[PDB]
């Protein structure tokens, strides 16, 4: 998931925004 | 914005910034 993706690869701020409430 | 390489607590800081007062969920794989 996002926590693993951002660490093992890269992720965008737009992808992180999917986890906002 | 630029892409991100975020591990551990650095990803929580990034979520905090992106989401602000909306809050967020931190959901690692177990």
Swiss-Prot record, chain B:
Transmembrane segments: none annotated. This is Insulin B chain. It comes from the Eukaryota. The chain holds residues 25 to 54 of 110 of the full protein.
